[PDB]
């Protein structure tokens, strides 16, 4: 406008609790509208204010008002935010951060106005003492308020839970101190308002006499009683908050301003109080605080109708629903006409039904399995029972899952649950561990409440009336203080020739178990932590097997293929080079497996490699005639690929009971709480079961768990990069460091992030213990340019995409001590031939794209990662920093120090074993199936943890009925798939499908689909889809950013896919098989999965040929035979027969 008139220049600011002058920004913005740029050639700005305030306006609008930093008022808040974010760790970091603020610049230019004399500037030109004094003064305020743990000795700052809440919610230090002193678990709704009204944000809010009468009318109408008086500021704040929630109409301008200011800061203050209460575990206070946060944001009481959250509904209809005081859940079961008739609003009945179904409502299912006597595994399935709406719900719905005891006062397990819009109408699996006390409560409360939606909470009482908790595990075998065992304790001189230069004395675990393993012939169970030398006990058993007869046959079973490769190399140079003993490694080929087993004295193989040979142990004499069966990592039977190991171990015990010569089973594994079941299942006695504790390792393990309360995985992964560098500098500045990454892509980012944190400080290239002259020979053989850039700085990286030469070179550089930090992927924990002093486990979870959820890492993988931080002679102790989310912090603390409870999972994957046993004639009837199942670990674990296997008791009728039902269910699945034939409902026989399934080691489901999906007119075009749909490809890795790449490969393959879903592993396998057949370029991550698919592709092709051979289809058999040849040659059937030859491009074909 041409003329602008600012009348009064006085605004009642609720923050100061009085009428203050207009701000500079408001005056400048108001004065900027004087004079239109189009028609006005000269503006006119009138500023009517007080005579004493005329100078401020003249200087502000005349370029005479200096910009002075006001950071002194909120110095502690800014310092707390930097400390919480990790930007500043000690006093020096805070001083450096303070130097980049406007206060430091203003303090140097104008020290007099900042409280600094000219003498101080002369004695400190850089202004370092003033920054230290300001940081110390700010740190004292933060330390006095319990915001940060600051010690005056070293100046280091420790981030506390209150500081994170205060920095996250912008709450002042005084407000945090008030919330800590006044925040109690027994605070009611009335006290919650008083605590909020006592915050430091409303310290200037005063109760004026001009509005006392109006406050009295609000005090008699507020639903929440106030123990304070009307003349106290706390009552006015509590009354203002209650009036805003109740929608009471105010009259005073000052009262309205105070209510708006109180309501605006109430949202952040309420969230901070809820976070503090939620962190403390107060279930009763958390529900009230969470309800209060939603009530303030929603501007409605919790007793009001839930339809008030949807602003599109009429108020008269909402009031009519409120007048008819009926339960909110009652409208869910009513139809559109019933809802309209119940409220007497037939016209709005359809809208009410649409609004009722659009409200968040999740159906909770509880699957509780007691892992231990004090720890229970709760698998909560959340099913969204509401129609998703972007205009009402948005991109995602935030919910909180709170686990509480019977009293509903202590939060056993609280975690955030983000319900994304793309993942609506689907069950979400939430797995967590809740503690169980000696006083077993009748039930637990699982409250899934919305984080923003009021009256949206689902309560699921997890009753423990029929919960049979496992019996208290026996104490682990104590490490007797025997004298160290010298090499002379062994008998054979040649046996001591392979350990003379290694160590003069054995470890205490080896000395205690050496007498039972080397000087004994009974089954020995050695439960010791990863790194105590369990392989030496197996070698003692191998030496015992080699002492009785020079032609012995020791069998070493490793749950991981990499462990067998590491053991095969270790065994080859020790058992073959120095003892002249045939040590061989089992392959995936059974044709060469029989020759290797018959010609080798030590047979190292995986559970899958030995299962194929052991399935026909009746015919194969080499499998039965075994003098020793070593099972390393027996604790792996409670995880993936564990049912095969349990079946192999059970088969080995059953074979040893009928061969006229027992097979000495040496079961080595981690320290397990339920070691009696493993010893009982493996035939180990009470004195031969060496089940130790995790704290008995030769190298003491210092395990530190850092909780990250970040729900998002990307933010949590990025926020832990700073902590990884801080943990390395605090735990091992000059020691090897191993960092575990959740994926192959995170290793490169983590390696650069550590370098970036190291480059931020003056300690550049501090992770390279050697010089660049000696790194040229190793850096020139690497293919990854980024690895050389990180390797030159002293920080290595490891992932599945790296070639073996690069992985071997990286391990060699780290083993020799040239490098200090190695960033290894989560999948490389088993395959790592090196150990560091400090082990970093950051983001202990993986993004499983099959279910679109962040699945936590298994305990076995974490145990191996923790075991990697074990230096026997070079390090006196071992550090392990486990950076994980706060929800899983309790799970790691229980399963890390205490023995690991292992439970067999053969009940879900017993179909393959049952078919193999039926084909071998081991199980000829239903009674034999139950008898065969009694030799496995599942039967032994069913009597100790019946609740884990859906059992109701340990009695014979319950155990016999459960085993019969499991046998009758697995047998029914085999009969329905045409794998076996059941005659008279009791006797089972092997069918054609079962023989093929158990011959090539194929899943029963794959054979059922092959037999029902293979016709007489099948071709190679449809053959790939049938092969790609086999159950063996369901374990393919689906990760983030893997759907876009597959889509690009779906338009280039020679075969189209009908209805291709990017989340289905079968589709990726078909695309990968087509890509391998066309020899097209693929990413490193895609090629890693292609090799895994190609490993089992040959067996599936052979099964298809066998299935077609029995079906009498010549055409389908020929296509399968051509596919098998084409799969090995990476060539297509539609192309010429010359692409198989190496170095032949399309030019030769043309």
């Amino acid at each position: 406008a041409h003329t602008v008139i600012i009348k009064g220049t006085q605004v009642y600011s609720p923050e100061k609790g009085r009428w203050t002058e207009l701000g500079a920004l408001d005056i400048l913005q108001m004065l900027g509208r004087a004079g239109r740029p189009q028609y006005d050639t000269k503006g006119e700005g009138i500023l009517i204010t007080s005579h004493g305030e005329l100078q401020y306006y003249l200087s502000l609008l005349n370029q005479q008002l200096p910009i002075e930093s006001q950071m002194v008022s909120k110095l502690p808040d800014m310092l707390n935010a930097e400390i919480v974010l990790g930007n500043v760790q000690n006093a020096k970091d805070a001083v450096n951060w303070l130097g980049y603020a406007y206060l430091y610049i203003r303090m140097l230019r104008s020290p007099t106005l900042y409280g600094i004399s000219h003498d101080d500037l002369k004695g400190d030109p850089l202004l370092d003492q003033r920054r230290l004094d300001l940081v110390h003064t700010a740190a004292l305020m933060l330390d006095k308020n319990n915001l940060v743990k600051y010690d005056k000795k070293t100046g280091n700052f420790q981030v506390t839970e209150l500081g994170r809440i205060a920095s996250h919610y912008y709450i002042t230090n005084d407000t945090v101190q008030t919330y800590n002193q006044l925040l109690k678990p027994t605070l009611s709704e009335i006290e919650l308002f008083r605590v909020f009204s006592l915050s430091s944000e409303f310290k200037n809010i005063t109760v004026r006499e001009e509005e006392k009468l109006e406050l009295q009318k609000l005090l008699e109408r507020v639903p929440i009683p106030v123990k304070e008086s009307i003349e106290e500021p706390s009552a006015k704040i509590n009354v203002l908050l209650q009036a805003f929630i109740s929608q009471l109409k105010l009259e005073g301008f000052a009262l309205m301003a105070d209510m708006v200011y109180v309501t605006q800061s109430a949202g952040r203050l309420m969230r901070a109080i809820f976070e503090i209460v939620l962190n403390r575990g107060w279930a009763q206070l958390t529900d009230k605080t969470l309800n209060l946060c939603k009530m303030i944001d929603k501007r409605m009481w919790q007793s009001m109708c839930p339809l008030r959250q949807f602003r599109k509904l009429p108020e008269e209809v909402v009031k009519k629903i409120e007048k008819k005081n009926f339960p909110f859940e009652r409208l869910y079961d009513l139809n559109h006409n019933e809802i309209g008739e119940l409220i007497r609003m037939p016209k709005m009945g359809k809208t009410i039904h649409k609004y009722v179904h659009l409200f968040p409502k999740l159906e909770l299912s509880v699957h509780l399995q007691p892992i231990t006597r004090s720890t229970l595994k709760v698998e909560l399935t959340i099913t969204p029972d509401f129609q998703w709406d972007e205009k009402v719900h948005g991109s995602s719905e935030a919910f909180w899952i709170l686990v509480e005891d019977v009293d509903s006062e202590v939060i056993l397990h609280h975690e955030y649950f983000l319900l994304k819009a793309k993942y609506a109408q689907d069950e979400h699996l939430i797995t967590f561990f809740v503690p169980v006390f000696e006083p077993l409560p009748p039930q637990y409360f699982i409250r899934v409440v919305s984080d923003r939606w009021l009256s949206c909470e689902t309560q699921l009482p997890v009753s423990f009336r029929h919960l049979i908790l496992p019996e208290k595990y026996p104490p682990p075998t104590e490490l007797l203080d025997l004298q160290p065992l010298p090499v002379s304790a062994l008998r054979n001189s040649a046996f001591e020739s392979l350990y003379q230069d290694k160590f003069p004395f054995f470890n205490p675990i080896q000395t205690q178990v050496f007498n039972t393993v080397y000087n004994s012939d009974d089954n020995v169970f050695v439960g010791a932590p990863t790194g105590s030398g369990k392989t030496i006990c197996a070698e003692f058993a191998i030496l015992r097997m080699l002492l009785q007869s020079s032609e012995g046959r020791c069998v070493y079973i490793t749950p991981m293929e990499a462990l067998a490769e590491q053991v095969y190399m270790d065994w080859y140079e020790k058992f073959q080079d120095r003892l002249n003993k045939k040590v061989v490694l089992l392959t995936g080929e059974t044709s060469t497996d029989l020759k290797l087993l018959g010609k080798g004295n030590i047979i190292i193989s995986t559970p899958e490699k030995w299962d194929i040979l052991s399935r026909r142990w009746k015919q194969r004499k080499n499998v039965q005639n075994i003098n020793l069966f070593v099972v390393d990592e027996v604790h792996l039977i409670g995880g993936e690929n564990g049912p095969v190991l349990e079946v192999i171990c059970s088969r080995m015990r059953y074979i040893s009971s009928q061969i006229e010569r027992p097979i000495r089973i040496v079961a080595l594994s981690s320290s397990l709480s339920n070691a009696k079941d493993v010893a009982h299942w493996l035939g180990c006695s009470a004195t031969s079961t060496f089940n130790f504790h995790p704290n008995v390792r030769p190298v003491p393990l210092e395990l530190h768990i850092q909780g990250f309360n970040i729900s998002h995985t990307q933010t949590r992964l990025l926020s832990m990069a700073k902590p990884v560098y801080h943990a390395i500098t605090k735990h091992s500045p000059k020691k090897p460091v191993i960092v575990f990454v959740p994926s192959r892509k995170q290793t490169r980012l983590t390696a650069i992030d550590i370098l970036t944190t190291c480059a931020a400080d003056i300690q550049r290239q501090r992770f390279l213990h050697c010089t660049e002259k000696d790194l040229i020979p190793y850096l020139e053989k690497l293919s990854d340019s980024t690895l050389k850039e990180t390797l030159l700085n002293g920080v290595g990286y490891l992932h599945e995409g790296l070639s073996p030469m690069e992985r071997r070179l990286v391990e060699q550089l780290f083993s020799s001590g040239a490098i200090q930090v190695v960033v290894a992927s989560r999948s490389l924990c088993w395959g790592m031939n090196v150990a560091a002093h400090l082990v970093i486990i950051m983001d202990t979870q993986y993004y499983n794209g099959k279910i679109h959820a962040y699945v936590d890492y298994p305990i076995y993988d974490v145990l191996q990662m923790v075991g990697h931080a074990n230096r026997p002679l070079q390090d006196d102790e071992g550090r392990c920093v486990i950076m994980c989310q706060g929800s899983k912090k309790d799970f790691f603390k229980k399963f890390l120090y205490e023995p690991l409870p292992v439970e067999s999972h053969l009940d879900h994957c017993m179909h393959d074993h049952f078919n193999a046993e039926i084909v071998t004639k081991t199980i000829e009837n239903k009674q034999d199936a139950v008898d065969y199942l009694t030799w496995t670990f599942l039967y032994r674990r069913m009597t100790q943890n019946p609740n884990y296997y859906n059992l109701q008791g340990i009695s014979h009728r319950h155990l016999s009925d459960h085993l019969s039902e499991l046998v009758e269910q697995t047998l029914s699945d085999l009969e329905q798939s045409k794998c076996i034939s059941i005659e008279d409902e009791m006797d089972v026989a092997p069918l054609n499908l079962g023989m093929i399934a158990a011959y090539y080691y194929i899943n029963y489901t794959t054979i059922e689909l092959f037999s029902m999906s293979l016709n007489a007119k099948t071709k190679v075009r449809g053959l790939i889809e049938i092969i790609s749909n086999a159950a063996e490809y369901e374990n393919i890795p689906i990760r983030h950013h893997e759907d876009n790449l597959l889509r690009q490969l779906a338009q280039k393959v020679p075969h189209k896919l009908n209805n291709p879903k990017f989340n289905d592993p079968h589709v990726k396998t078909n695309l990968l098989l087509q890509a391998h057949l066309s020899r097209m370029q693929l990413s490193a991550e895609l090629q890693s999965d292609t090799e895994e698919i190609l490993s089992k592709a040959i067996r599936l092709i052979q099964a298809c040929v066998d299935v077609l051979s029995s079906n009498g289809w010549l055409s389908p058999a020929l296509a399968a035979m051509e596919l098998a040849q084409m799969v090995t040659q990476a060539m297509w059937s539609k192309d010429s027969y010359l692409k198989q030859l190496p170095h032949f491009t399309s030019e030769h074909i043309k």
Binding site: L75, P76, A91, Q129, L132, D133, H136, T137, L140, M141
Partner: peptide
């Protein structure tokens, strides 16, 4: 050497 000042 640090001195607490009047914030």
């Amino acid at each position: 050497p640090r001195q607490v000042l009047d914030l």
